[model samples]
Target chain A: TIQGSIVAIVTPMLKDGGVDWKSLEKLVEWHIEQGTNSIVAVGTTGEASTLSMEEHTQVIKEIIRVANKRIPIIAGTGANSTREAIELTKAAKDLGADAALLVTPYYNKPTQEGLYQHYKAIAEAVELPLILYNVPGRTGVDLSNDTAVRLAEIPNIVGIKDATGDVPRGKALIDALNGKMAVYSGDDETAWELMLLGADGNISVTANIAPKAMSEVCAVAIAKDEQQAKTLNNKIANLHNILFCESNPIPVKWALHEMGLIDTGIRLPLTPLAEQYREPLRNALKDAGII
Target chain B: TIQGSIVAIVTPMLKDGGVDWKSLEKLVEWHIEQGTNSIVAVGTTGEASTLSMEEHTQVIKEIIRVANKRIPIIAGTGANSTREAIELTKAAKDLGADAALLVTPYYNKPTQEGLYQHYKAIAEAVELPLILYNVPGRTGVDLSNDTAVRLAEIPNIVGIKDATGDVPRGKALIDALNGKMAVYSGDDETAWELMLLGADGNISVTANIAPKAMSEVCAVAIAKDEQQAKTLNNKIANLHNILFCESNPIPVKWALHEMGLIDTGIRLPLTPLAEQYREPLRNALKDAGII
Candidate 1:
């Protein structure tokens, strides 16, 4: 039943490296006001890997606390190791997270069978509704659609955040699962098209910038207004492309700071967006009325 | 001045998935016997990521303990976060490791400046010899040679395990550094060619299978015996290709198990060689006479 725009929200930071909890809480409130129906804290957009485990779990707890049942909060609790993932999922359950969004194990590319086992182990060990995340570009391994279908048979495993950006392939996943599990488009650019093709919603990076537009696009698709969805899709496509002109949350973080939705503090390893990309991204932000 | 056949030695494992200390001692004995001149213990090949922090230090300690100054051990102690790496490097130094191999931050995708800061931070904090590891394929980020040269100015920043496998680029790194730091090919398939092109040696995966032949190849190259080096290189060409037929250490691990070097206890996520690949791999092993 998860539907509408679910921003893969960035974890805001101060000019210094510390997590900006006050801005984080404020950003969650903004999303709620802007009509983003669900939220995911500490996704790739949130720089989950760079955050220490304590910072990781703290971001999730803070988001869920401020969200206060206003929207679903999906915590990024996946790790390359099964034991670490299970431990994090258990922690998320204790934190009262709505569900856990588990990214596919990166660096250590697992076999399809291994992928099935990794997710099943987490689902079985921690009794929480699990959202599977697949982004091979970053993870170095793709959890195949066949494996996704196999995982759907497991009771506690709920849905997927499909980020492959191959819409036809995502459609195949939707078809093969036969409605047993929900599939959300993790890429913002194709969110509307994916929704038209039956993806449940989007776990979006662009939502940090244009939550209201994303929600409207979701509404148009959910209402089966194909023409309206296409119009919205065309309108917001540039925002999607430019926000990811750099890596996830880097350009988006800069946009948020420009829009005054959040502070300008982005964490290291991921510095702020490249200066060259700033003007075009800013124009897109202004075009979208977010600036 | 470091060069020649270097083994990213596998962590000898018991049937129960624990490190087999006796097998490790035996491995050290055998590597010397087989002519692996330098050793890299607790590297990615040794499953460093999944090892607990304590196990990581213990594995390095045990390798240094049994090595007994017989061979140099390059302990893998890299982390996405700088602080974690400094702490790990300090422990490796205390454990008497000859050098510390720090991989570029995986998953974090640090900017070149960030990469400089990351390595500089470790070099400033730890007193051990440091070898930068730039394997962009796994890490999803490149440690550019320019940044590397800047890092090479730090006296203790000794060399790099360059896995990019572009021969001209490898040569360029050597030329750019101008003897400021040594360059070692991290990819086994291209190592012989790289060594010919002035890369000092290989930090190899294929050596895990045929250490004697690889050692001979390195010996000929370092001695400026090009014809002899090519002969040995041709002899082991199939091995270099097959070892990476699947991802690194997957086929290599199987080759080791087939050769009776170790038990087949590769952790989850990296399964044994697929059935279809089995006969071709065996053919490569038999060609090299390790099976």
Candidate 2:
């Protein structure tokens, strides 16, 4: 049942660092209006780490409440610790989230078995449909395809957000899962191609800035229009490359701010883009016509 | 004045995972007895990430109390945020620890200018000497040696822990610092070579098990006894390779537990060594005579 373009939407904040609920609601309405198949709330693009647990759960609840079946909201509920992840996942489930996007454990690197145990514990503890997230470059650990297959046997562990840019690896994961579960691209750069090769969707960072373009690419790719998909993908490729000009949410925040979609603010540990990167980022915005 | 083997000492834990103060105190006494010239406490080796800030600061305080100026104790007080790092460094200074080892920001990476600003902020905030810890392989960011010199201009920013395992890079760092700051190897495998290349110390993880052997290697290397140093280093080479067979503190914890020096309990996220790794680690320990 999981397919098409899923945007990992950013939690819009005001100029003073407060959550911009009005803007966030507006974004959700706009994405739904544009045919965004599903919405992932508070994924890394949401700056989940910087948000306190209470604020984290609040974002999920608000998104679910506002989206209100207009689209399914996949809550970002994973944590480095098993117990904490379970608690968050359970809370998201109770709050009426349609699914949960669980990122691999970050900071505390775990072995494959440890990762299996971490996810298995959550799957057993929480009853919600779960989508595993593996972005090793950020999380410091990869949830191997072998491990993914083992986890797929659990009914609730329905899919994965494979952010690893290795296309062959993605193909291997889809092959191994035997279609028992779906695979989603976690990286925006190759999300469309991945969906063409049988990935169900993408949980995207670039979707924060270019949701409509990414959504069109995914829609066409999923519809088996390869030629049209590639063209649409190229249109947004510059946005994808520039969104990561720094790290996730860094350049994306700036792009959103320039587009007037969100205010000019980000939390501590993460500042706005450096002065030097500002000009190039502005150009990307102009090219996208977001500014 | 810093050249030699320094132990990134393990926090001896009881079977229950609580800090074992008696064993930690004894380890400190033994490191001093075995010629460990400098001691780094509460490092990643000490599970700094999971330790409560209270436990973190208290452990630094306790190590200082136990070490009693018998040796310098450098505290691991780094965080991903600059404000948090400053707070930790100030606390370490207040605890009377000899120096603070600030790891480059992990998870939330900043630009080189941001890196410069982060360290500069800490150096300005604290009066005690500081050692920049550059283990980018784990931290997701690297503090270039040129940045180290920029930091060196600050009166208290005194040195670095270079774990990049790149010798020419270390040589360039040494050349550029020109003795303005000390460069210490964070890896045990190449610590002696780094020392010979004018690095002032080895802040070693391997020293957790074979303290006597590591001490002799550092002693010979510091005294310019190349032949003796090479012999000792070669003897412990297997130990170096095996300890890192898994992510650090994993194999190292197993090695220490195997030696009956500490309990095998590690924090969540980082489980103890897998069953398969036990024999290889055991053989390494036996080879090193720690078994």
Candidate 3:
């Protein structure tokens, strides 16, 4: 049911590093108006690593409130600790989030058995629909296609967001599951192409800045029209490549700030996008027609 | 003045998963009795990711108490958030740790400037001797050699743990610093080789089970006697390779538990070493004369 451009939205912040509640609300409403099918609050793009537990909880609660059922709010409840991930997912479910996105344990480098037990433990502990995220670049571990099929056996394990950008692997997962679960392209650059080959939609960073175009691209992509989807995707193609000019949410957040959607407030360990990237991103924004 | 084989000690646990305080004390004493140069408390091998903040504080406190200055105790205080890392390093300093090991920010993948700024921020905030850790394998981020050199400019940034096992890069970093900072080999397999090439010593995982051997290996390794050090390192070469058979700490913890040094309890997300690996590891233990 959750199948259009699902924006991995940023958590807007004030200069002092507190969550900009007014802007958070505005972003939610804008996504809904722009036809984003779902919104992921406090995801990696939302700077989930830096946010404290209270802020993490509050961000999800506020997004769900602002959405008011107009959109499905998927909470980023992933943690390196299994107990902690369980706690966050439970909180998200209790707070009325429609689903939970659980990234594999990072840094610790859990083995395949450990990764299985980690996700399975979460699936069994929480009843909410769980979307397993496999971004091996961010998480040093990979959720193998075989492991994905094994995990699909669990009832509440409803979907996966393949961020590897491997079109064939994405297709293989889709083929392997046979609609038993949904597969979303967690990478934007390849979202439309993957969708053309049967990914559900995108859990997108680009959507944070251009939700309307992403939604239209997904709509066409989902309709099985590769030609139309690519044409539409190409219109905003510059945004896709440049938003990743640095790490995710960095350039996208900068793009958001340039559009006057957010402020120049990013947490430490993630400084504001570098001055060197500024002019290049601004030109990309112009090409995308956002300026 | 921490050097030589510094064991990244595992937090022993009871079958029910509480910290096995008695075993914890025993390990500290064993390290001292076995000639370990120093002990790293609550590190990645210590399951810092899974332990609660209170538990983390308690582990460090107990290790320092047990050490009683018999050996230097370096606390693992790394966090992806610069704010959290600062707080942990501050806590370690206040709690009487000799130094702090801060792994490069993981998962978030900060830019080179972001990486430089992150360590710079922590160095400015904490007066504790800081050892920057670059373990790109697990952390999904690398601290460039240039960034390491830049960090060495800080007075308190006294050391770096090069875990890449790239002897050339490790040697290059040692050459780049020109003794402005001490470099420790973090990979046990290459520790001897790197030390032979001028690394001060190793911040080791293998040392957890074979303290005396590791300590001896370092003494000869640091003495610049390649012939004797290689002979010494070769004695436990199986351990260096097998302790990493599964991810890490998994196999090492199993080795300890087999030695009756700890319990069968490892926290979730890191199960006890798999049954498939049990016989092989036990054979490895026998081959190493551990049994």
Most accurate candidate by DockQ = 3
The residue-by-residue lDDT of candidate 1 on B72-118, one tens digit each, is 88898887777678888999888888899888888767778788888
Give model 2's TM-score versus the native structure: 0.91
Residue range A1-291, candidate 3, lDDT tens digits: 799999998989888888899998998999999889999989999999999999999999999998999878899999989999999999999999999998988988888878889999999999999999999998898989888888889999989999999998889889999788889998889999999888888999989888999999999999989899989999998888888888878888888999998997888899889898899988888888889
**Docking quality band of candidate 3, CAPRI definitions:** high
Question: lDDT: which is higher, 1 or 2?
Answer: 1
- Enumerate the chain B TM-scores of all models: 0.96, 0.97, 0.99
Question: Model 2 - which docking category?
Answer: acceptable
Tens-digit per-residue lDDT, B168-272, candidate 2: 898899899878888899888888888877888899998888787888888778777778878889989998888887877888888888877778777666688
Ranking by lDDT: 3, 1, 2
DockQ of each: 0.52, 0.37, 0.84
Tens-place lDDT per residue, model 3, B180-269, is 889999899999999998888899999988899999999999999989999998999988998988888899999999998899988888
**Model 3: residue B136 alpha-carbon error in angstroms:** 0.7
Error of 1 at A57 (Å): 1.8
**TM-score, candidate number 3:** 0.99
What is the Å distance of residue A105 in model 3 from its true position?
A: 0.6
Please give fnat for model 3. Answer: 0.80
The per-residue C-alpha lDDT of model 2 at residue A225 equals: 87
